[PDB]
């Protein structure tokens, strides 16, 4: 995050594993994995994204 | 089989005997700093990162000072194998975001209610007779340093809120049970005088916290105060609270939250300045009992 | 680093060294009564009362001798953690009794497909990316000691079923997967030549096993055979089966149950005579990855 330091927020940031419909609002991405970000307090957030995959590997 | 047990002398000029005649106990006489004695009645903290399922969160009290826990097998009632759903229920789940003005009177909802149509929580709560959960509750919001405002955020254990009409405990079931949009106080009390189409609503107006109760003694619940100048967020752990182990949980409400405004809104010279609050509440440590077809509440 | 083995001499007048060159293995060349030798290629039996979470049953194969098992922690692919429904999913659902009569040609159903509308299982399989079950399969047909008739009972791993098209592969989602309704076989293969309008359908021929293979040869796969005058039901316990740990239950369908009047179905001398099939599906050792929004596939 790159605003002044007297900005604040909290974002979501979500991922879904494939076969729904893709999130279209904070509703559903809620349901998913999902990581929950202060700007105000870090200005750098981390989520993983665990390998989860019916085969095991995909193609590039 | 005499008892004698020793007397506090007050006044002085010293044991006194006592035997049970009847084979029923209830037949029995009665026997008789800033250190908190009742610690766990000021609302304990738990004393960052919290994940629970694949949800994750980046101030936080215990209720009671008792982390949600399964029921033991010492105190089980029902004899069915319990389902416990695990990661799939207990989860992060955020509601709908409430807007916080300069005129709001405070908002409030229940739990379960609350989390009803919310994934596999909801499915299971409403596939199962009985359903048991305690919750992390994580109100948050987020303002610059020249805001002034602070909320107080409220744990009550069987919240009920009083009704709009001169008829007692007239509140319908819908309008009891309003999901994750909630419902808000009231600065005053207004009686519902429809008496051909009564909405049958809560009225709870703010100073009585909505029960008849001063709301400054709301502090007795467990709590926790957003200052805006000092914290974004509050954490509330509430185990399950009830007069039995296990309950149904589409009929009965096991808590309820309240954030009230207890310091107005207020912002540089703007009359006009909002701040969204978002609720998430985890289901923590869900069991569910009494598997049959899915329960389906009348609504509207 | 030589490897002298020992040939097998034949034609009389006795070792033979390989050395492999390459440090890739692909490279290297090949180095080669009643009792069944294959016991688990001959449908072995559970060698009464069989409950599973609430529901209880009172001619039992397992599927090449293996009973349905948990992924073990060494061919786990998926990383995050795993949802195990337990008895709230794992139970007996009973499907749509179907009437055999002197002219039925057969039936058929996908497995997860037959159970996506069952309960909480069919919640946990539509919620989730990842799935992964086995099944015990009980199939109930009861008649007179005067009523003859056989039906063979297959369960059949990638059960792929031919088209009724000129168009390879060209049968649609909503045709391929008719959840508990299932299909029946025809005696005979019908082109659909609406191309206009096709009906992107099976059609699946008895004697050739809807995949053009002889049915007669059907018993290679699991199977049972429900005969009228010796037994009322048969039962197949099914463990998963798949190249993969675990996969989409949307997507794959892993088991389909074939139903074949082998004997046709006849009464003392009453031309019309039919008696109910009823399916019994218990899914076993549930466990799903990947909780997200919950799917909503196409329909009709």
């Given at each position: 995050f790159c605003g002044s330091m007297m900005a604040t927020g909290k974002l979501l940031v979500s991922y879904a594993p494939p076969g729904?419909?893709?999130?279209?609002?904070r509703k559903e991405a809620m349901l998913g994995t999902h990581v929950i970000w202060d700007i105000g307090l870090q200005s750098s957030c981390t989520m993983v994204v665990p390998w989860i995959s019916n085969t095991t590997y995909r193609l590039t | 089989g005499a008892q004698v047990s020793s007397q506090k002398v007050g006044a002085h000029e010293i044991n006194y005997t006592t035997i049970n005649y009847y084979r029923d106990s209830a037949s029995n006489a009665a026997s008789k700093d800033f250190a908190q004695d009742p610690s766990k009645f000021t609302e304990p903290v738990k004393d960052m990162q919290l994940t629970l399922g694949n949800s994750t969160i980046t101030n936080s009290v215990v209720a009671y000072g008792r982390w949600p826990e399964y029921i033991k097998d010492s105190e089980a009632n029902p004899v069915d194998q319990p389902t416990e759903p695990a990661v799939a229920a207990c989860r992060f789940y955020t509601l709908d975001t409430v807007t916080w003005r300069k005129e709001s009177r405070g908002w409030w909802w229940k739990l379960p209610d609350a989390l009803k149509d919310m994934g596999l929580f909801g499915q299971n709560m409403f596939y199962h007779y009985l359903g048991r959960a305690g919750y992390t509750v994580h109100v948050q919001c987020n303002a610059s340093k020249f805001h002034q405002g602070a909320l107080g955020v409220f744990a009550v254990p069987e919240m009920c809120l009083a009704g709009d009409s001169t008829t007692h405990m007239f509140t319908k079931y819908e309008n009891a049970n309003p999901g994750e949009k909630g419902g808000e106080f009231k600065g005053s009390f207004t009686l519902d005088?429809?008496?051909?189409?009564?909405?049958?609503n809560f009225c709870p107006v703010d100073y009585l916290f909505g029960s008849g109760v001063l709301a400054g003694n709301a502090f007795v619940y467990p709590h926790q105060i957003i200052n805006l100048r000092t914290n974004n967020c509050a954490t509330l752990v509430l185990p399950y609270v009830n007069s039995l182990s296990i309950d149904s949980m589409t009929k009965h409400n096991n808590w309820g939250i309240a954030i009230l405004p207890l310091a107005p809104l207020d912002f540089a010279?703007?009359?006009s300045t909002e701040i969204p609050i978002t609720l998430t509440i985890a289901p923590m440590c869900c069991e569910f009992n009494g598997l049959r077809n899915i329960t389906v509440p009348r609504t509207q």
């Amino acid at each position: 995050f790159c605003g002044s330091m007297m900005a604040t927020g909290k974002l979501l940031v979500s991922y879904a594993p494939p076969g729904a419909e893709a999130p279209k609002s904070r509703k559903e991405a809620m349901l998913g994995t999902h990581v929950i970000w202060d700007i105000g307090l870090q200005s750098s957030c981390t989520m993983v994204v665990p390998w989860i995959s019916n085969t095991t590997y995909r193609l590039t | 089989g005499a008892q004698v047990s020793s007397q506090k002398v007050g006044a002085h000029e010293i044991n006194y005997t006592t035997i049970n005649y009847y084979r029923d106990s209830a037949s029995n006489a009665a026997s008789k700093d800033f250190a908190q004695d009742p610690s766990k009645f000021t609302e304990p903290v738990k004393d960052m990162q919290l994940t629970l399922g694949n949800s994750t969160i980046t101030n936080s009290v215990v209720a009671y000072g008792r982390w949600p826990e399964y029921i033991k097998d010492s105190e089980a009632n029902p004899v069915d194998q319990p389902t416990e759903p695990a990661v799939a229920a207990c989860r992060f789940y955020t509601l709908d975001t409430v807007t916080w003005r300069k005129e709001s009177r405070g908002w409030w909802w229940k739990l379960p209610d609350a989390l009803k149509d919310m994934g596999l929580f909801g499915q299971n709560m409403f596939y199962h007779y009985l359903g048991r959960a305690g919750y992390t509750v994580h109100v948050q919001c987020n303002a610059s340093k020249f805001h002034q405002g602070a909320l107080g955020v409220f744990a009550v254990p069987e919240m009920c809120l009083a009704g709009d009409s001169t008829t007692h405990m007239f509140t319908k079931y819908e309008n009891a049970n309003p999901g994750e949009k909630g419902g808000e106080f009231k600065g005053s009390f207004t009686l519902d005088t429809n008496a051909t189409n009564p909405a049958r609503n809560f009225c709870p107006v703010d100073y009585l916290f909505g029960s008849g109760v001063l709301a400054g003694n709301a502090f007795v619940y467990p709590h926790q105060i957003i200052n805006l100048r000092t914290n974004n967020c509050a954490t509330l752990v509430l185990p399950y609270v009830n007069s039995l182990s296990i309950d149904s949980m589409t009929k009965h409400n096991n808590w309820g939250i309240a954030i009230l405004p207890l310091a107005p809104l207020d912002f540089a010279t703007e009359s006009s300045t909002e701040i969204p609050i978002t609720l998430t509440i985890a289901p923590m440590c869900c069991e569910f009992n009494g598997l049959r077809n899915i329960t389906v509440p009348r609504t509207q």
